Design a protein around this ligand. Sequence first.
Ligand SMILES: *[B@@]1([O])O[C][C]([C][O])O1
Length: 261
Amino acid sequence: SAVQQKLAALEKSSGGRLGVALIDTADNTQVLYRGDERFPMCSTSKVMAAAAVLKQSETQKQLLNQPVEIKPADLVNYNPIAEKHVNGTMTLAELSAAALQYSDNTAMNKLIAQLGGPGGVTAFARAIGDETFRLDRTEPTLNTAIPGDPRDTTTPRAMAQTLRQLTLGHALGETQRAQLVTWLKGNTTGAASIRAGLPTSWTVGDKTGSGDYGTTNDIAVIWPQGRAPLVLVTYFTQPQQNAESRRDVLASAARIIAEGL
Ligand SMILES: *[B@@]1([O])O[C][C]([C][O])O1
């Protein structure tokens, strides 16, 4: 279609590999570009860790208020929020918020630990019907984004369907779902990514990811004013290990998608 021609052209102009999946919940139509190719998730995986903990809280009703100690040894490479609570505690709710809204890597590692390891995060994905997601490592090594390495990858199509189920569907309880949406809507790291390609009147909840090989990702739920919501996943990775982030590519893909509606 027109939109696939333009996404192909954008990809060609960028020098990298672009993966896009859009789900329009109005008619359950999908637009896919490299939709079944694997991409490194980087920090977009944090949505799955947070949702898994939310699912646990449906039975352990007080789980999110459980304090978790932040020790110096827990600190890894990017801990904007956990750093503020070293030698203190954060609740599982505060860690989930920090992982999602600030992409805090220490928070993510605490969520993985709560789930019994990366296998516990992957297990939740399987439980909600995502056969494609795989989490293999903890922070920060899950961001190595090595070409062809299947570790810590998913496909755009799979992530779009799963994000739809978590935020708009009923993979989570009503309170848990609302909490996840609130967290995503309050993301602080997404201004230059999908959000930048869309009308300012639209409400967006998203989770960015960045990693080696110039990997630049964003997954978003989008609420246009007076219109059915959309789920948009944009994955981008590059051939040079030290390539710079290209958030502009995600903005541009979002703009191209938005134009076609
Ligand atoms: B994710 O990708 O977002 C930021 C951090 C950097 O390691 O991980």
